[PDB]
């Protein structure tokens, strides 16, 4: 959740969901 600490660019933004992105930043 929470995005913009990150865009998620390494999170998974190139596919991932909002509430599976918790597993890659705590949060
Ligand atoms: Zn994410």
Known sequence: ???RR???WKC???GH???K???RQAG
Do not use: D, L
């Open 6 to 8: 990150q865009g998620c």
């Open 21 to 23: 992105c918790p597993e």
């Open 1 to 3: 959740r929470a995005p």
């Open 17 to 19: 969901v909002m509430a």
């Open 12 to 14: 998974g933004k190139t």
